[PDB]
Amino acid sequence: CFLFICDLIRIYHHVLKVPIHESNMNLHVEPQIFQYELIDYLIISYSFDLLEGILRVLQSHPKQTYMEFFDENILKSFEFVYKLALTISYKPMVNVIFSAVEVVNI
Amino acid sequence: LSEIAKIMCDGTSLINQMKVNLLKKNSRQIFAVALVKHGLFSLDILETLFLNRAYITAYLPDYKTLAEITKLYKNSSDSENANMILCSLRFLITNFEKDKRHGSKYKNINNWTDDQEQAFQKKLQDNILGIFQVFSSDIHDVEGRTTYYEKLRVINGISFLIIYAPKKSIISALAQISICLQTGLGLKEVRYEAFRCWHLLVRHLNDEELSTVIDSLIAFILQKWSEFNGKLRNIVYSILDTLIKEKSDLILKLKPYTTLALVGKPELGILARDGQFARMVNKIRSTTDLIPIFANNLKSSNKYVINQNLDDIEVYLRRKQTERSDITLVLGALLDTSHKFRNLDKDLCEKCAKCISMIGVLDVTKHEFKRTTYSENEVYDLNDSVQTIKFLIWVINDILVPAFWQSENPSKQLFVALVIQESLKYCGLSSESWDMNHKELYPNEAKLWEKFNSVSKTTIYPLLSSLYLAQSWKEYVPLKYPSNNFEGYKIWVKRFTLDLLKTGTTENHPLHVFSSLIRGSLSNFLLPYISLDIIIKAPYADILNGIIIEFDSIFTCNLE
């Protein structure tokens, strides 16, 4: 599930790295839908929220079943998402900010 | 004197080379100027300093360019001593005179030299150019030394220049120093005494002036009113008072629009302070179709001025319509506003759209003043030498003027001065248009060259540097191929360098080519006027050089 959703996220990696600010040309004239925004927002969030929940079920599993899951794939995939998330050159996004950093906490 | 040695050593083994380099810097750096202001003006003592740690050749040679502004940058009641010291340093610019007894005599008592009362005039009007170049380099460059300390000091010095400058050197780059101080005031901290300086200007300039700089200030103030404290408002009030009193016809008759806007902004107490002022303002206003006035104000580009225009136009239209009641040009003005905005600042574009909402489609039968064409007119550049004169004046007046005025480009004004004076050798004697019966009768006064008429009639300083561009002439494949490949800006540059290739006759074309030689759309505009000589000739080398591109670009590698 986990990898499937991280790379789901990289299928929606087109979110958490939206620019640092609305440029003079970039408009906010809009179809004004909160629909697909909330859509992908729920998506991204809920997904990171997966990351959260299943990873914490990992942490709450018996200590025996631990290293069998941890490979450098976790580092690389979560590295993709973290870089996507806690931007230093885009808009940060408090929820994903949350999620990502607690994964660090994980 | 060993302090400089320690500083260089920290800079060690080649500390002698460091001393050589530092002395080279001090040639035009502030070392000579500040020593002049601190100790004395003796060029012999200057040689003594040149022997402090060594390194004297540049003394006679490097006496003019940068040390002038270096000294100027300290103009800051007891300091009248420093004022006279500085004024004496200004007196002594001539390196030969420094070598002469003038070297130790130009720092004399208040009653200094009196042939200087015109020779010194000439001196200052000369390198007013250089010192402006210095300050614009200090302002509009990157200035990794951001350090608005320099900005403050330069403002102090230029203010003292208003304290002491003839009309001629004033107008030498009045508009330039205007833009310099203007962007200063735009910067946050400067305003506190940028407005002080503005008032200093106000107290004594002119009547023909006090137009081309004031509206910028007016827009600024009647726009940013929110972020003005008490004493800012106080100095503002003083400024208003000066506006009212010392130059009233300007606010009332020569730029009344400011009055319209400020009165329509009723948190200022214009009638409260002066009810008589209010009367005149309102009268002239209700009297002459303000639409063309807002049209002229929209012809000031920038941004603050444009926004003020939009808002005031909206208000006027609203009240007039609520009543019951030329009309057209505001529409196209807004058109351009948005069109330039079409890539920059959506808020400005929305303001233009709000004004268009108030207006709208209206009637098409109502004649639309959209033009037919423009002036690509010619005037025998070969024969009818009088028409050649027409040709040159047409070139300079058409677009070279506002570029020479509105551009924010330090060095380009250098070419401006140089080649425009080179064109002004047709009216080289200042008295031709100045005091005389002389029938110079210069056309194309344009109220800007008219504003510049004296400041350029005989203020010529040659400034004619250009070299080493012939062989690489991108022409014939080196041009058609480069343009078909990419880039296009440099393609235009290279093509227009067809003059550097095989044109540039010393009569007109040399100066004309060297004009844009500093080197960006102007390229395209100047381009149409080259190959006529050769196609007359009846040469073939440059003919092919041009024709190769001018016909290969017909379909040069489409669908790249």
XYZ file of C-alpha atoms in Angstrom:
666
model
C 0.000 0.000 0.000
C 2.675 2.410 1.134
C 4.978 2.491 -1.858
C 1.905 2.327 -4.044
C 0.717 5.527 -2.511
C 4.031 7.330 -2.386
C 4.349 6.786 -6.083
C 0.697 7.640 -6.375
C 1.868 10.896 -4.858
C 4.585 11.247 -7.426
C 1.704 10.754 -9.822
C 0.353 13.823 -8.054
C 3.776 15.353 -7.391
C 2.313 18.204 -9.461
C 0.886 19.778 -6.308
C 3.181 20.436 -3.389
C 5.694 22.341 -5.510
C 3.385 25.027 -6.857
C 5.305 28.333 -6.977
C 6.447 30.565 -4.091
C 3.702 33.177 -4.825
C 1.065 34.326 -7.377
C 3.197 36.076 -10.069
C 2.119 39.445 -11.606
C 0.984 37.490 -14.732
C -0.260 34.273 -13.001
C -3.962 35.034 -12.539
C -6.459 33.936 -9.940
C -9.303 34.281 -12.393
C -10.579 30.797 -12.268
C -13.301 28.269 -12.966
C -13.274 29.032 -9.270
C -13.863 25.401 -8.537
C -12.976 24.272 -5.128
C -13.844 20.928 -6.620
C -10.678 19.552 -8.141
C -8.627 21.603 -5.782
C -10.346 19.988 -2.807
C -10.200 16.808 -4.827
C -6.469 16.709 -5.125
C -6.062 18.333 -1.736
C -7.963 15.533 -0.094
C -5.980 13.246 -2.327
C -2.544 14.525 -1.454
C -3.378 15.040 2.186
C -5.270 11.815 2.779
C -2.439 10.158 0.973
C 0.240 11.657 3.162
C -2.151 10.801 5.863
C -1.937 7.237 4.814
C 1.796 7.653 4.992
C 1.176 8.840 8.498
C -1.232 6.155 9.592
C 0.296 3.071 8.071
C 3.745 4.215 9.008
C 2.600 4.638 12.553
C 1.035 1.245 12.482
C 4.525 0.176 11.514
C 5.936 1.957 14.547
C 3.246 0.342 16.716
C 3.946 -3.133 15.295
C 6.191 -5.559 17.323
C 9.873 -4.395 17.138
C 10.707 -7.770 15.445
C 8.849 -6.822 12.194
C 10.863 -3.624 11.427
C 14.054 -3.758 9.241
C 12.272 -6.279 6.895
C 10.378 -3.228 5.468
C 13.103 -0.600 5.586
C 15.142 -0.413 2.401
C 16.701 2.568 0.690
C 13.519 2.665 -1.392
C 11.888 4.273 1.627
C 14.659 6.861 1.649
C 14.392 7.589 -2.067
C 10.612 7.613 -2.439
C 10.014 9.583 0.720
C 12.910 11.761 -0.361
C 11.087 12.572 -3.572
C 7.966 13.451 -1.641
C 9.702 15.435 1.104
C 11.558 17.534 -1.447
C 8.242 18.011 -3.218
C 6.644 18.994 0.076
C 8.566 21.226 2.440
C 9.426 23.577 -0.342
C 12.099 26.190 -0.087
C 11.208 27.595 -3.526
C 7.427 27.276 -3.730
C 4.349 27.667 -1.574
C 4.618 25.579 1.589
C 1.376 23.902 2.495
C 0.682 23.483 6.175
C -0.989 20.076 6.055
C 1.677 18.476 3.940
C 4.167 20.328 6.056
C 2.697 18.489 9.015
C 2.615 15.103 7.415
C 6.070 15.116 5.919
C 7.688 16.320 9.078
C 6.051 13.689 11.201
C 7.354 11.129 8.784
C 10.703 12.547 9.660
C 9.573 12.003 13.205
C 8.861 8.426 12.178
C 51.615 56.303 6.387
C 52.450 52.697 7.311
C 48.732 52.108 7.929
C 48.188 51.805 4.180
C 51.143 49.402 4.145
C 49.531 47.215 6.807
C 46.180 47.301 4.991
C 47.791 46.235 1.723
C 49.834 43.535 3.454
C 46.642 42.097 4.907
C 45.172 42.303 1.396
C 51.782 40.670 1.451
C 54.812 39.449 -0.477
C 53.760 41.599 -3.450
C 52.689 44.450 -1.167
C 54.704 46.754 -3.421
C 52.496 45.689 -6.324
C 49.538 46.227 -4.020
C 50.800 49.745 -3.341
C 51.091 50.355 -7.074
C 47.534 49.146 -7.637
C 46.171 51.115 -4.693
C 47.908 54.265 -5.896
C 46.382 53.623 -9.307
C 42.994 53.457 -7.602
C 43.708 56.615 -5.600
C 44.471 58.432 -8.845
C 40.743 58.931 -9.457
C 39.404 57.484 -6.191
C 38.536 59.723 -3.243
C 42.106 59.783 -1.911
C 43.162 62.940 -3.722
C 39.807 64.619 -3.140
C 39.685 63.892 0.581
C 43.296 64.883 1.092
C 42.415 68.120 -0.686
C 39.492 68.705 1.656
C 41.420 67.670 4.790
C 44.896 69.150 4.488
C 45.189 71.689 1.671
C 45.165 72.073 -2.126
C 48.923 72.091 -2.827
C 49.818 69.860 -5.768
C 53.337 69.835 -4.339
C 51.875 68.307 -1.189
C 50.040 65.939 -3.538
C 53.403 64.825 -4.888
C 54.560 64.501 -1.278
C 51.666 62.116 -0.666
C 52.646 60.364 -3.906
C 55.979 59.797 -2.142
C 54.432 58.696 1.178
C 55.055 55.014 0.412
C 56.445 55.286 -3.146
C 53.552 56.338 -8.250
C 53.179 59.962 -9.349
C 52.584 59.806 -13.118
C 48.782 59.888 -12.896
C 48.932 63.074 -10.800
C 48.995 65.415 -13.786
C 47.008 63.004 -16.012
C 44.216 61.758 -13.740
C 43.142 65.122 -12.333
C 39.579 65.282 -13.707
C 37.195 62.357 -14.006
C 36.370 60.544 -10.789
C 38.053 62.666 -8.142
C 35.565 65.373 -9.139
C 32.627 63.381 -7.777
C 34.834 61.989 -5.018
C 35.185 65.542 -3.740
C 31.545 66.295 -4.522
C 30.429 63.444 -2.258
C 31.068 65.317 1.002
C 28.971 68.495 0.672
C 27.015 67.596 3.848
C 26.640 75.923 10.904
C 30.366 75.911 11.605
C 31.123 73.740 8.565
C 31.252 76.835 6.341
C 34.975 76.165 6.545
C 34.368 72.806 4.868
C 32.072 74.498 2.362
C 34.783 76.927 1.282
C 37.380 74.151 1.256
C 35.168 72.113 -1.040
C 34.383 75.116 -3.230
C 38.107 75.751 -3.553
C 38.632 72.102 -4.475
C 36.077 72.733 -7.204
C 38.005 75.848 -8.228
C 41.115 73.706 -8.737
C 40.396 71.081 -11.382
C 43.070 71.970 -13.955
C 46.098 69.715 -13.531
C 48.378 72.286 -15.163
C 47.082 74.967 -12.798
C 47.789 72.502 -9.990
C 51.356 72.368 -11.280
C 51.318 76.178 -11.385
C 51.122 78.604 -8.474
C 47.388 78.119 -8.923
C 48.092 74.736 -7.336
C 48.738 76.364 -3.978
C 46.612 79.464 -4.677
C 43.179 78.027 -5.547
C 42.586 77.376 -1.820
C 42.790 81.119 -1.141
C 40.371 83.314 0.811
C 36.670 83.847 0.044
C 37.574 86.411 -2.600
C 39.026 83.688 -4.812
C 39.810 84.020 -8.513
C 37.259 85.894 -10.591
C 38.062 84.768 -14.109
C 36.994 81.487 -12.544
C 33.524 83.035 -12.384
C 33.317 81.832 -16.007
C 36.261 79.490 -16.584
C 35.153 77.560 -13.496
C 31.636 77.672 -14.949
C 33.015 75.914 -18.009
C 34.909 73.443 -15.824
C 31.881 72.419 -13.782
C 29.586 72.189 -16.786
C 32.133 69.874 -18.354
C 32.412 67.055 -15.817
C 28.959 67.480 -14.414
C 28.728 64.702 -16.998
C 31.328 62.570 -15.250
C 30.031 63.103 -11.733
C 26.508 62.235 -12.838
C 27.972 59.118 -14.408
C 29.529 58.350 -11.043
C 26.303 58.774 -9.124
C 24.134 56.825 -11.545
C 26.735 54.084 -11.305
C 26.312 54.358 -7.541
C 22.514 54.128 -7.819
C 21.180 52.148 -10.767
C 23.843 49.447 -11.001
C 23.848 46.252 -8.953
C 25.757 47.998 -6.138
C 26.763 44.941 -4.185
C 27.810 47.816 -1.979
C 24.096 48.520 -1.570
C 24.885 50.828 1.297
C 22.417 53.653 0.816
C 24.847 55.662 2.917
C 26.257 56.540 -0.493
C 22.786 57.452 -1.692
C 22.331 59.796 1.241
C 25.689 61.454 0.774
C 25.183 61.813 -2.968
C 21.802 63.374 -2.314
C 23.456 65.820 0.056
C 26.050 66.675 -2.553
C 23.585 67.104 -5.386
C 21.444 69.270 -3.131
C 24.489 71.441 -2.592
C 24.789 71.421 -6.358
C 21.343 72.995 -6.529
C 22.780 75.330 -3.912
C 25.463 76.172 -6.489
C 24.992 75.448 -10.202
C 24.391 77.615 -13.288
C 21.326 77.058 -15.418
C 23.487 75.509 -18.127
C 25.147 72.804 -16.045
C 21.842 72.339 -14.219
C 20.011 71.448 -17.411
C 23.074 69.491 -18.514
C 21.395 66.509 -16.878
C 18.510 67.957 -14.889
C 16.199 65.194 -16.065
C 18.833 62.559 -15.349
C 19.481 63.703 -11.801
C 15.712 63.909 -11.525
C 15.412 60.217 -12.302
C 18.250 59.478 -9.895
C 16.658 61.320 -7.000
C 13.299 59.951 -8.086
C 14.269 56.319 -7.714
C 15.948 57.324 -4.491
C 12.668 58.650 -3.132
C 10.963 55.540 -4.424
C 13.326 53.608 -2.208
C 11.912 53.581 1.295
C 14.346 55.323 3.615
C 15.375 58.101 1.232
C 12.112 60.037 1.410
C 12.756 61.516 4.873
C 14.983 64.123 3.269
C 14.365 63.283 -0.360
C 11.363 65.503 0.108
C 13.638 68.013 1.814
C 15.680 68.023 -1.374
C 12.531 68.320 -3.435
C 11.642 71.421 -1.458
C 15.137 72.774 -2.005
C 14.528 72.372 -5.709
C 11.125 73.998 -5.315
C 12.491 77.111 -3.661
C 14.468 78.139 -6.771
C 14.475 76.484 -10.155
C 12.635 77.971 -13.114
C 9.255 78.437 -14.769
C 9.805 76.288 -17.849
C 10.921 73.551 -15.468
C 8.774 72.467 -12.524
C 6.759 70.335 -14.902
C 8.757 67.298 -15.976
C 9.496 66.179 -12.412
C 6.656 67.454 -10.266
C 3.798 65.220 -11.378
C 5.797 62.169 -10.365
C 5.969 63.605 -6.867
C 2.286 64.545 -6.934
C 1.242 61.055 -7.904
C 3.515 59.611 -5.261
C 2.036 61.688 -2.494
C -1.625 61.556 -3.474
C -1.180 57.798 -3.874
C 0.749 56.548 -0.839
C -1.121 58.693 1.673
C -1.657 55.783 4.057
C 1.986 55.345 4.997
C 2.787 58.949 5.924
C 3.460 59.815 9.552
C 2.956 63.109 11.335
C 6.073 64.984 10.358
C 5.976 63.579 6.870
C 2.546 65.160 6.663
C 4.035 68.331 8.142
C 6.773 68.638 5.552
C 4.128 67.754 3.008
C 2.097 70.715 4.168
C 5.120 72.951 3.795
C 5.524 71.575 0.284
C 1.904 72.326 -0.507
C 2.423 75.819 0.796
C 5.442 76.353 -1.436
C 3.447 74.970 -4.364
C 0.679 77.456 -3.655
C 2.893 80.465 -3.112
C 6.158 80.477 -5.047
C 4.832 78.885 -8.238
C 1.054 79.157 -8.416
C 0.466 79.468 -12.172
C 2.063 76.054 -12.593
C -0.378 74.314 -10.282
C -3.250 76.484 -11.450
C -2.554 76.743 -15.169
C 0.490 74.735 -16.208
C -0.347 71.416 -14.519
C -3.795 71.858 -12.947
C -4.489 68.151 -12.964
C -2.671 67.740 -9.664
C -5.020 70.265 -8.122
C -8.023 68.408 -9.501
C -6.885 65.160 -7.954
C -5.859 66.549 -4.588
C -9.060 68.559 -4.184
C -11.081 65.504 -5.164
C -9.123 63.788 -2.404
C -10.824 65.590 0.487
C -8.696 64.648 3.493
C -6.188 67.438 2.878
C -7.944 70.703 3.778
C -7.164 72.514 0.481
C -10.234 74.806 0.906
C -9.682 74.832 4.717
C -6.140 76.257 4.213
C -6.984 78.376 1.104
C -10.624 78.773 -0.064
C -9.454 81.152 -2.845
C -7.230 78.350 -4.269
C -10.272 75.991 -4.297
C -12.382 78.544 -6.286
C -9.871 78.943 -9.187
C -9.197 75.163 -9.286
C -12.919 74.165 -9.502
C -13.611 76.934 -12.100
C -10.816 75.931 -14.567
C -11.840 72.251 -14.018
C -15.611 72.483 -14.805
C -14.477 74.786 -17.683
C -12.258 72.699 -20.089
C -13.147 69.037 -21.146
C -10.766 67.254 -18.681
C -10.760 64.146 -20.981
C -7.755 65.325 -23.174
C -5.963 66.373 -19.896
C -6.273 62.807 -18.503
C -5.176 61.666 -22.008
C -1.939 63.723 -21.721
C -1.455 62.390 -18.140
C -1.824 58.767 -19.407
C 1.066 59.632 -21.799
C 3.504 59.527 -18.810
C 3.757 55.669 -18.613
C 5.609 54.631 -15.378
C 3.017 53.098 -12.952
C 2.022 55.459 -10.066
C 0.958 58.178 -12.568
C -1.067 55.577 -14.606
C -2.924 54.362 -11.431
C -3.728 57.955 -10.318
C -5.029 58.639 -13.877
C -7.302 55.523 -13.865
C -8.828 56.310 -10.413
C -9.460 60.043 -11.084
C -10.898 59.261 -14.612
C -13.329 56.731 -13.062
C -14.455 59.305 -10.419
C -14.958 62.088 -13.059
C -16.951 59.833 -15.461
C -19.133 58.578 -12.540
C -20.098 62.098 -11.340
C -20.629 63.473 -14.921
C -22.980 60.531 -15.775
C -24.928 60.702 -12.450
C -25.496 64.314 -13.664
C -26.788 63.757 -17.295
C -24.299 64.791 -20.023
C -12.683 63.995 -26.621
C -14.689 61.175 -25.065
C -13.034 58.571 -27.252
C -9.320 58.644 -26.550
C -9.537 57.373 -22.983
C -10.715 54.084 -24.453
C -7.613 53.552 -26.575
C -5.441 54.834 -23.763
C -6.821 52.113 -21.542
C -6.278 49.740 -24.448
C -2.556 50.407 -24.382
C -2.544 50.290 -20.590
C -3.873 46.761 -20.579
C -1.806 45.741 -23.592
C 1.429 46.597 -21.802
C -0.087 45.062 -18.694
C -0.985 41.977 -20.763
C 2.209 40.539 -19.341
C 2.842 42.846 -16.339
C 0.686 43.517 -13.229
C -2.860 42.188 -13.501
C -4.082 44.756 -10.979
C -3.232 47.618 -13.317
C -4.985 45.767 -16.100
C -8.058 45.307 -13.914
C -8.074 49.022 -13.192
C -8.055 49.673 -16.918
C -10.917 47.193 -17.244
C -12.879 48.900 -14.480
C -12.607 52.150 -16.379
C -13.761 50.337 -19.497
C -16.669 48.862 -17.549
C -17.775 52.373 -16.669
C -17.530 53.169 -20.369
C -18.156 50.271 -22.726
C -18.991 49.419 -26.324
C -21.058 52.577 -26.916
C -21.390 53.560 -30.581
C -19.180 52.709 -33.528
C -20.754 55.413 -35.682
C -19.272 57.792 -33.155
C -16.093 58.343 -35.093
C -13.161 56.347 -33.765
C -9.902 58.284 -33.965
C -7.799 55.209 -34.744
C -5.014 56.502 -36.948
C -4.062 55.620 -40.523
C -0.242 55.393 -40.344
C 3.001 56.943 -39.024
C 6.110 58.760 -40.302
C 8.591 56.629 -42.243
C 8.987 59.811 -44.360
C 12.348 60.546 -46.034
C 14.245 63.761 -46.925
C 16.988 63.411 -49.644
C 19.880 62.143 -47.445
C 22.016 62.158 -50.659
C 20.991 65.392 -52.502
C 19.075 68.423 -51.101
C 21.536 68.759 -48.239
C 18.826 70.912 -46.668
C 16.657 67.811 -46.728
C 19.617 65.921 -45.278
C 19.426 68.418 -42.427
C 15.739 67.573 -42.240
C 16.754 63.916 -42.165
C 19.022 64.335 -39.161
C 16.609 66.536 -37.239
C 13.857 64.030 -37.975
C 16.031 61.232 -36.626
C 16.901 63.008 -33.417
C 13.467 64.452 -32.675
C 11.292 61.465 -33.565
C 12.337 58.923 -30.940
C 15.900 59.815 -29.925
C 14.431 62.535 -27.727
C 12.304 60.528 -25.235
C 14.849 57.744 -25.231
C 17.379 60.423 -24.378
C 14.897 61.525 -21.706
C 12.891 58.598 -20.386
C 15.512 55.873 -20.561
C 16.918 54.487 -17.337
C 20.344 53.787 -18.839
C 23.499 55.494 -17.521
C 25.995 55.098 -20.336
C 23.527 55.632 -23.171
C 23.227 59.278 -22.190
C 26.944 59.475 -22.890
C 26.338 58.697 -26.546
C 23.327 60.989 -26.249
C 25.491 63.935 -25.285
C 28.278 63.052 -27.687
C 26.517 62.412 -30.962
C 23.656 64.809 -30.295
C 26.190 67.589 -29.868
C 27.907 66.240 -32.981
C 24.558 66.790 -34.666
C 24.298 70.160 -32.940
C 27.396 71.456 -34.694
C 24.725 72.597 -37.152
C 23.853 74.975 -34.289
C 27.124 74.782 -32.369
C 27.316 78.411 -31.224
C 24.997 78.608 -28.218
C 24.053 82.224 -28.929
C 22.567 81.055 -32.233
C 19.412 80.087 -30.331
C 20.413 81.838 -27.091
C 20.852 85.593 -26.682
C 21.470 87.034 -30.161
C 19.643 88.132 -33.255
C 21.023 84.910 -34.723
C 18.539 83.114 -36.978
C 19.187 79.600 -35.720
C 15.407 79.305 -35.280
C 15.908 75.721 -34.232
C 12.833 73.599 -35.000
C 11.668 70.530 -33.092
C 11.913 72.372 -29.793
C 9.452 69.795 -28.433
C 9.521 71.560 -25.037
C 12.179 68.997 -24.139
C 14.878 69.944 -26.606
C 13.510 73.414 -25.985
C 14.036 72.493 -22.355
C 17.420 71.272 -23.584
C 18.026 74.057 -26.116
C 20.626 75.952 -24.109
C 21.884 72.814 -22.337
C 22.919 71.348 -25.678
C 23.484 74.355 -27.950
C 27.160 74.605 -27.032
C 27.632 72.218 -24.097
C 29.456 69.839 -26.427
C 32.072 67.467 -25.046
C 33.249 65.058 -27.754
C 33.156 61.567 -26.147
C 33.796 59.647 -29.371
C 35.042 56.141 -28.455
C 34.389 53.195 -30.807
C 36.852 50.694 -32.290
C 37.697 47.172 -33.480
C 34.517 45.760 -35.009
C 35.201 45.589 -38.761
C 36.455 42.108 -39.631
C 33.932 40.129 -37.618
C 31.120 41.940 -39.503
C 28.308 39.339 -39.270
C 27.127 39.737 -42.911
C 26.479 37.221 -45.776
C 25.805 33.829 -44.013
C 27.548 35.086 -40.798
C 24.250 37.015 -40.540
C 21.575 35.162 -42.509
C 22.580 31.902 -40.840
C 22.927 33.392 -37.328
C 19.478 34.946 -37.616
C 17.947 31.797 -39.106
C 19.482 29.874 -36.198
C 18.584 32.150 -33.297
C 20.335 35.552 -31.427
C 17.662 37.593 -33.156
C 18.480 40.586 -30.976
C 22.148 40.200 -31.839
C 20.998 39.405 -35.383
C 19.410 42.849 -35.553
C 22.508 44.333 -33.943
C 24.746 42.700 -36.529
C 22.518 43.666 -39.445
C 22.344 47.279 -38.290
C 26.088 47.074 -38.010
C 26.019 47.130 -41.815
C 27.145 50.708 -41.215
C 30.119 49.476 -39.221
C 30.618 47.191 -42.215
C 30.529 49.575 -45.179
C 28.638 52.749 -44.214
C 29.247 55.540 -41.736
C 30.167 58.466 -43.951
C 31.694 61.193 -41.812
C 28.977 63.613 -42.964
C 25.944 62.027 -41.283
C 26.130 58.240 -41.305
C 29.259 57.999 -39.094
C 27.661 59.828 -36.188
C 24.303 58.195 -36.882
C 25.822 54.719 -36.623
C 27.938 55.554 -33.601
C 24.746 56.827 -31.984
C 23.315 53.451 -31.053
C 26.867 52.114 -30.976
C 26.674 51.732 -27.199
C 24.089 49.000 -27.765
C 16.790 46.977 -27.720
C 14.040 47.346 -30.288
C 15.525 50.591 -31.608
C 17.514 48.341 -33.945
C 14.465 47.456 -36.009
C 13.345 51.088 -36.229
C 16.725 52.317 -37.420
C 17.195 49.361 -39.750
C 15.158 50.497 -42.825
C 17.657 53.134 -43.926
C 20.911 51.572 -45.100
C 21.248 49.839 -48.481
C 19.922 52.832 -50.408
C 23.429 54.178 -50.973
C 24.645 50.990 -52.628
C 21.507 50.398 -54.654
C 22.095 53.947 -55.862
C 25.780 53.391 -56.576
C 25.403 51.657 -59.944
C 29.752 48.504 -52.766
C 28.768 45.147 -54.250
C 30.575 43.495 -51.333
C 28.347 45.147 -48.742
C 25.472 44.798 -51.213
C 25.781 41.024 -51.002
C 26.594 41.274 -47.284
C 23.140 42.706 -46.732
C 21.161 41.056 -49.508
C 22.173 37.566 -48.399
C 20.257 37.921 -45.144
C 17.610 40.321 -46.486
C 16.524 37.640 -48.962
C 17.483 34.423 -47.148
C 15.325 35.410 -44.196
C 12.465 35.189 -46.690
C 11.827 31.597 -45.623
C 14.889 30.954 -43.480
C 14.339 27.520 -41.909
C 10.651 27.672 -41.135
C 9.031 25.248 -38.693
C 12.044 25.101 -36.421
